[PDB]
Each structure stands twice: as structure tokens, then as C-alpha cells.
Structure 1
Amino acid sequence: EVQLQQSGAEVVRSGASVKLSCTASGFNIKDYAIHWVKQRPEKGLEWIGAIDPEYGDTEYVPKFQGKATMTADTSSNTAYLQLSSLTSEDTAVYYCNAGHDYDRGRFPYWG
């Protein structure tokens, strides 16, 4: 009963922003450590950043700083990942995964 629902596939022209959503990860008092992973058919898996609901902390990768913006809505909800100037290298499958309660390595619950 622990599954994560996202926004859905989207076809975007170059130079426009897109906003991805996650669900059922990020509640009051609990406390998850949400991560986002990019999957390009050539580069495999790439870690984007780690966001902590409740506290709302934010950590990024220098490759994606300025490209990916992370937000968290403490009620319900979350975790919104938005990308700005979209180029051909952003065509990928994005995942919202959360290890149970905290930390980085563990992704047993994927979007």
C-alpha cells in the first residue's frame, strides 16, 4: 500500500518549462527523504537531488543546479520537480523515489 503516483508523460517544445509531481511521500511528522532520479537511454541513472518534507531541506547536483527546481508542499502531497529551459538532453524518464523515512542510498519505494 506504499506506491507513488506521478504527474504523467508530457511532450514539450524546446524552451518551455515542465512541472512534475509526486504523491503519498511527504507528510507532517513523517519525514521522508525524497530523491529524484533521471533515466536517459544513454547515461543510465543520474541522481538529481534530495528533498526532505517537514523541514523542507534541499540538496542538488552541480550539473542540475539552475536546471531543476525542487519544491515541497507539507500538507498532503508533493514532491514537485520542475525543469526550466528544456533541451533535447532532458528527454528522459524521471522517478520520485523515497527510502523509508530517511537518507540517500535506499530507494525501495519508487514512483
Structure 2
Amino acid sequence: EVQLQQSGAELVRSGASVKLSCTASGFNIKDYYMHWVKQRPEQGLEWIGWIDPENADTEYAPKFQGKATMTADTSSNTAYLQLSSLTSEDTAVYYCKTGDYWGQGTTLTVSSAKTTPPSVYPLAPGSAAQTNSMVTLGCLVKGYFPEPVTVTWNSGSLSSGVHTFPAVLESDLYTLSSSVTVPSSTWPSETVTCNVAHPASSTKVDKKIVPRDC
């Protein structure tokens, strides 16, 4: 049963180092080269280097020479990738691979931000405003760090008609929004509340949407 098991997600501060691991089972790492690959959403896949665990020989892509150090502990069938002098440009998923087998990836987040709970703001439609058979409401979840937040509507009871958007980074902090579309027959007689948990800050906020009744 060939399996490359990578270490868990890490969140670190700019300037730090990390040492990612990749443990093989079902074969001997001394028999084949092990590679590492970086993936970011915008910039895509980039090959970092390989190590030959049989003799500890390495080759790095020039751009990673200053940054990456590959090693292997053959007695524990594990390869390691040390990444140093980290910056936000190192925030990525890192994969190990050998032969035609890829590991599951490790997410690395690098930031200088301080832990910050989101500011959660209601996006309230007009009451008098009668928008076809359906009404869209929302919540803005602004300026938090780190990921993730967990957004629910009506304590999780309302999942139909929800769009919770991917977070985007604003000046080192994250922002996202969530919309929910409900039957106009039900609103505002049935209340709608967003719930936004941010475990990293020991917070969970509720914002009841109150109709803008001008």
C-alpha cells in the first residue's frame, strides 16, 4: 500500500523557518528520488528540487537554492523540506512526490499579521423593498487573521441559497462575505442571523439582519 503521508498545516511568522515532513510506507525511500513541488492559486505549480535518499544527493531549482534544504532520514522512511527566511510569497501548498505518487500536500501560511477577530457587519435589505419572490441578505466579515472563519446562517439551519465567498487578503488581513437568498414570503417575519466563528480569537459573533425600514 504505497502512501506518502505529509505533516500537518503550519502557520508561521515572516522570517521563520519550518521543516515539513513526508513519510513513505509500502516502499523504501532509498530506492527512488523524492521531489518537492510548490503550489499557489495565482502563480501555479513550481518545482523545488529532488533528493536521492540512497546517497543524500540533492538538486534545487536556482530560485530555491537560498530557501529550501532537503534531507532524508532513511531509518524512518521520511523526507524533510526545510524552508527558511520565510515570507508571504512562501504561503503555498507543498507536495512531496516520488515515482508517480504525490502526497496529500501541506498548507503553509506565512504572515506578519497579529491574531485579529473579524468585524462582522450585517448586509440588510430594505423591508419596503420587495425584491421579486426572493430576498438576498448578507454578512461582511472584515479584517481577521488567521484563517479560517466558519460562517453559518440561523445556527446552521439555513444552508439553501447561501454563498460564502473565498477569503481574500487585504493588507495582511482577511475579508470575506456571505449572502443568503430566502423566500420573500418568509422575510422579515422569520429572522435571519449570520453566525461567524473565529476560533483563533476565541470569538463567535451573531448578527441579526434587521430590515432597513426607511
Pairwise TM-score range, normalised by the shorter structure: 0.7 to 0.9
In the superposition, the TM-score normalised over structure 1's length comes to: 0.86
Of residues 80, 102, 113, the one that matches 1:110 is 102
Alpha-carbon distance in 1 for matches of 2:63, 2:39 = 15
Q: CA RMSD in A?
A: 1.5
| Match in the other structure for 2:28 | 27
| Match in the other structure for 2:165 | none
Alpha-carbon distance in 2 for matches of 1:93, 1:11 = 12
Task: Report if the CA contact (8 A) 1:33-1:50 is conserved.
Answer: yes
Structure 2, unaligned stretches of length 5 or more?
Answer: 104-214
Structure 1, unaligned stretches of length 5 or more?
Answer: 100-107
In the superposition, the TM-score normalised over structure 2's length comes to: 0.46
Where in structure 2 are the equivalents of 1:13-92 lying within 5 Å?
A: 13-24=13-24, 27=28, 30-92=30-92
TM-superposed deviation, 1:27: 2.9
Alpha-carbon distance in 2 for matches of 1:78, 1:52 = 12
TM-superposed deviation, 1:109: 0.5
Q: Which amino acid aligns with 1:84?
A: S
Higher share of residues assigned strand = 2
Show structure 1 runs of 4+ deviating over 4 A: none
Q: Which structure's CA Rg is the greater one? A: 2
- What is the count of residue pairs matched by the alignment? 102
Larger relative contact order (Cα-Cα within 8 Å, sequence gap ≥ 6): 1
| Match in the other structure for 2:158 | none
